[model samples]
Target chain A: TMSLQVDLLNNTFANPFMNAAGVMCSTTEDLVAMTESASGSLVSKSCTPALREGNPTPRYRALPLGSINSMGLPNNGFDFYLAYAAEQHDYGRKPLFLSMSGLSVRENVEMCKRLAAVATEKGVILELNLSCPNVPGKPQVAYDFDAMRQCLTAVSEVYPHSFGVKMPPYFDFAHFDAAAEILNEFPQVQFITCINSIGNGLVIDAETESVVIKPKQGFGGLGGRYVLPTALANVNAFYRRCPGKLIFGCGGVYTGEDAFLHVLAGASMVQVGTALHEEGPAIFERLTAELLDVMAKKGYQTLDEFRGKVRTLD
Target chain B: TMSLQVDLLNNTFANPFMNAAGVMCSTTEDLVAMTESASGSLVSKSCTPALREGNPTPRYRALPLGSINSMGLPNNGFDFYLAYAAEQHDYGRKPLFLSMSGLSVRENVEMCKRLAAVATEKGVILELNLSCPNVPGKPQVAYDFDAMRQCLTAVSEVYPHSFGVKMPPYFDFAHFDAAAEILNEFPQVQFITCINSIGNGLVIDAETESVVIKPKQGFGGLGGRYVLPTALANVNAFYRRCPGKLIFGCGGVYTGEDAFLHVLAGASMVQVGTALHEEGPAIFERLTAELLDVMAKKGYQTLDEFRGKVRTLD
Candidate 1:
């Protein structure tokens, strides 16, 4: 018998599958639905210090190969998510990851102090959203290494606990090296979620002769099949580079095989985005079953045997 | 009538169609074959100063959605390509591009000086490859901004003509902004080819319980559908940032629809790689017709109408 269970940061998860931060976990109703689903963990949609309406209509669209969006951090608010995290729920059944994406460094620091204050017995994990690329004028924090270091230093100092960061995909080795060097400075930054989305892609409908999305003139974060390779690259790169940190793979995962690849490439867990948006939380059941099936066929009795074992031609 | 013709470097290309440097354009026979095919232009394989075998066999693999290769810049040397460049060809029918990838700064300068001496009677475009991620331990030069600037500064001074460059994909806006800034420094650097494959991805064959390729322990540059968005981002980023320069879109193109997307995203020309390698030069005929079909359906009367016209949501 094979099991997909994973132990992370002194906590145990039944399986290594979860919804990516922004997909279906956008509302309380959305969060509840994800909680009831089969995913081993549920992440809240990244929330800001204040509620936001986000970008305009038609902010997201599903393409044949993937999906794209500029859903500008529309959320109920940090208090909304914090309330949910503090509520009595099945924390025993599955872990909960609360994503924090503030509009400014001050806002993030304020929220971190608040989350740290509510020291729940069951323990709600904090995932700092450092790479939200949909904000019109706001540059992604992770892309600006100095800002990233400063943010982490402030948050980690006040938060006083283990946390993680949601990072954007990096292409060059220099970036990987530089980012990892900065991340390693914060031992409190225990985990890294590789890839938010490849940001600012322009999707057009030639028939309409217009952009598909209303926000950023149809220029938004790109995900799904088009990003699978880059996703693997980031995951594998970070996994190899950051030995002390665990990795959560996101981007371009729509199948059991894709999930398996992420794990093999060095992710301890895999997050689903575009597929979840298209198929709903119900897709988790299929993904888990599919992943288990792949494991069986390959004679992998446990995830440890093959996790991070992608062989090199070297 | 909609015409795909493009004017670049004070010359007209029949259409914005060509094969990327490393695909099937490695030999004289391969070059001639593409010349006779439906392609509007063709480029020679990236050549080193000395003849050398590329990475070992099993270096290339076609995946279900894309392809990977670490072919290590194997070619018949700079002189071999230089010999062909000097010989009289039907230059009036289609312009040719020669790609140079040197072992070091001195080698590239040495080759550039020789090319400068010839002053070909017929135009022979030169494309310096600043990014090749396949060799075992050689870091991609483009990722090192100082090295890139120095190399271009040295080469462009002696080369003394309009040339282009094949760049690797960049994910960060900071990188895109910085690279574009550096490129805009040289007026002789006429065109910038966006993306030379998302580099150093590891592909595994679950069935074989091993890696699919033979070099760098199965690490190779990734291509095809997986890189479409990043390719578009680089193309459009440079197109918007470098008004004085042109963009050559490469990576993740397999259909006429893909070709249409490139031009709309601001590429003056589109380069085919894995698809061309998988389907052969004959793919050009189908691509051309398919592009024409798309243009007809969209009521676009000329390439100028939709070229770089991807509207963003404000």
Candidate 2:
């Protein structure tokens, strides 16, 4: 399916708003706005057991096409989010799905265990994000099929709610049949959200071409309306090749049709990635409202009624 | 608000899936995928009464950062869309919006009279388009408040459905207030959708010191994410200055939150204009769905919940 499983997705980018890891994006007010404006789920930035100064400066360059970010996932440690008077909505509109982040497999497992306790009382889903470009090696944990499988397997053991892997697009894995096969082996980790950035993406001004922007030397993934078809194809490919594992399709999506396409392809839900960098969180509000308005006219009572109905080759 | 808008928007970019403005953008099969995957309200390109060959090549150009085009408005005329298969849809799932194009005020009135009849049977709203660059005199006709007022008044007199104007942001005349006042005179003209483009906007290439591909031109109204803030401001201005007209704020809006800001600034409803050009119609769906999701998150039930909140000085 082109869309992703709602249970496995996080609405963070849905709002097109985010405070980069270790970077304070929105305050309580901002979070309030973000939470108020955000989508299906919320995946708080990566948290480490210990506080650390993230990688040094020149970490970000807001280019014309988009931005190049290389902030070494400097986080205020995992405790900050959990600490500092953490709170949920009194309005009861908190994210439908909640995911957490970590530095290592063991750390993530511990995070799940802690989240399990927190979940007992707080009642939120646990999402394990083992891959992120800003951080070195951690994201590498999910670079290949085995690494990805092992990572999810570990994260799944401690949590009962939901477990997902957010990894960049890996051409090496080709249709992702091998990866999906491994994911299916673990019942705890049921969904797969693949096709992130190309990983440490590269760019050159072709001018002084001297790395146009330095320090963030390693460019983050590329996204926008541009990458949608590739992402769609990947999700479609995985859905067709791997039967059961839920796929969380993401990459270049920026619209509801893209989301629907994902759903149609195999994604029960969809994710709006890089375009968030170009647009902003407001996109979420527009997509959701307008989509439903359209659906209201289309005779669709439920999303599942027509998820990923595309693909005519057969 | 930096982005501008392309008035009388029609996806002229031909691909295989859909066709618009009498242009075969995609095939019939593509049309089906579009209708199925499309996100927001489906609006047929504004139709004129008589079939006409549009402007010749070199009609479009990218100027500055925004897009500009002198592509003379080309239409298969209103009769085509009237008879076109676009009418087919599962009205229960997606609401369809129709944009009507007219050469003369009388034509607009006649179309609406017919549209009103159809709306009664089909159940849809009419999107009034007063801006079209391709139609020789459209710019001036729309720029002329009296003419616009007269045309809107005529259509207003006959149509029972909600309709709004798509206006250019070229004059900086604060035309919105005056125009809004005129439309307000007739309850039939629901709102004013503003900031059509920065003078048939443009997106230039600094490298060659020449116009870029896509929409090629030096001057034309601009539309895209850059114009959203301006659109929001204009919507807010009209909302505050006018006598309570329903406002369908348009321009560079790309997301729900951006739409939210428009609502807060005084828009009763919001439209995805330039963003569609850059992202696609699905952008409409993304915005709509996310809007509902945000509304639910913030404990809002209707569009009125946060309308004009941001625009209020108090």
Candidate 3:
């Protein structure tokens, strides 16, 4: 009952919760289910210009620690999500987000331009994906500063609106500094989603003595509790480094406590991935309840008092 | 007790237990303590050419999930540890490892040459610290494949013997492939320590609303349970990629069950950090007992039976 509303980029969300791109977002049915759910927002799976069948079977496996997948961006064409975004959004209830990950930069720019034209309404948000770790032939663009800068420059020029980029988690401070410096150059970039997943982690089931997934010889993006610390680190690093840009924390969120930690670490909004994949849309209700319970115990009425207020020992 | 012996790089260790560099191995007294304790082997704190006091106060903080530190590689200088390697090492009781990190590639080469000259004995081992994330101004060299390749090539030529490289965790398959390719080129690089830490993680106290450490505005290396999944992934990745090289797993280990996970993931020897930092040398006894207990439960006589046998559901 405590106010969980969040205002980001001139739009206010009922709460700081949403399904991360790539989880329960591959189809129109999935998008519609999110609209019916209690989540504060909805996001489409990252899409390429053309329909992608993605990787082979047994692409995802759930383990005790987390889940692993080399799904390889399996989704319908860009037009499918765009049609859904253009048709299903109701700003009064919750916001809708359209995520794009082009096979090439030119395709990304084309899709960005297309989405900018079609979903220019107030309820839709756009997220450019610079990091998708499961693709076999493609390397993540965010890892290369020059390509990231170039992509941002192109997208910002073609699309005349504030947007966000989904970035891979960086391990080195130099990389963080470099990425932040690049992001700072573009004022049009309003938000930076911290972390995609700890990519390319291999999981093995003890009995079979083989890889769990079929893609890239058993390597895939790692998610769930295993990534909580890294996810929080990436979120906090971007939060501290980019004063002008908002951060959307993703990865390693399962419970309301995990969401609370994400907000405490500077996330304006938090996205759920593996947990959502495992628990279904109703997980949002449990998380919201959990978050409210935490707030009540802490004797706080609003997140504004505690958001991004993690204390460091002197 | 279960027989936990491991055969690595033509040497058989009595057990697969050791303290990671920078844990209890920072001082001569700490090193002697580890050598005297139940640990199968010991490594020195990564040393520089001259003595360093390291970073200022509040350099480390322990948390519920893990620990973070920006200790800045404080050590009693290279000669202090080198003298011990040259004179004080007892080849009779257990093996001794000398760890060195340099501010520059030149310094690393110099230290490598120095260690090679002094510690040619049977029980003496060399560890080149290619990644130390806590350094104030230094970026880890392992993140850059070219620099790491050059360093290894130079060190291998001069050392004329087997050595190991302590590596930072990598999140991408390309990085893993690239790093493994470079390491594979040098046959003398016999062992690969799976991870240093997931670096630059921020920890804050909710009450103080401040950073935990004084250096780098609270950014430091993350360890303990927070890094268990990433640690296992790295250990398994290198184990699969570099057939010729053995893996020494580090990070996210607290109990015998944790050690079993590492061995199942392909680590021949396991190094404990944050747990050791909290529990002290006595953790070795507990870990050994725990490992034995797990082995007993699994009905395995030796580590060789289950090591690297992580099963994947097909």
- Leading candidate by lDDT: 1
Give per-residue CA lDDT, model 2, range A1-314, as digits (tens): 12212332333223212222212222345345545555554445555676657666655554544444556665666566454224553225544334355666777777667666655555544445545655643445554456666667776666776555554443212214455577678776656665554344333331221233343343343444424444654666566655666677765465565555556556654665455545655766666665455456555655666554543311
Model 3 complex DockQ against the native: 0.45
Tell me, by TM-score, which candidate is best. Answer: 1
Alpha-carbon runs more than 4 Å astray in model 1 = A119-122
RMSD of each: 2.2, 22.5, 2.9
> Where in model 2 is the C-alpha error above 4 Å?
A1-30, A62-67, A84-86, A89-91, A96-99, A137-139, A172-175, A216-218, A241-243, A293-301, B1-314
Evaluate chain B of model 1: give its TM-score. 0.98
Best by DockQ: 1
Cα displacement (Å) at residue B9, model 1: 1.5
Ranking by lDDT: 1, 3, 2
lDDT agreement of model 1 with the native? 0.86
- Candidate 3 per-residue lDDT, tens place, B191-296, comes to 9998898888766554445667888777789998778767888898899899998899998889888888888899999999999999999888999898898888
lDDT by residue for model 3 (A7-122), tens: 88777888899999999988767887888899989789999999999998879888777888899999998989888877766667888888999988899889888888665665
Count clashing residue pairs in model 2: 110
Docking class of 1: medium
Q: Which CAPRI category fits model 2?
A: incorrect
Judge candidate 3 at residue B142 and give its lDDT: 95
Off by over 4 Å in 3: A63-65, A121-123, A206-211, A255-257, A289-309, A312-314, B1-3, B121-123, B207-210, B289-301, B304-314
Place model 3 in a CAPRI quality band.
acceptable
Q: Supply candidate 3's per-residue lDDT for B304.
A: 92
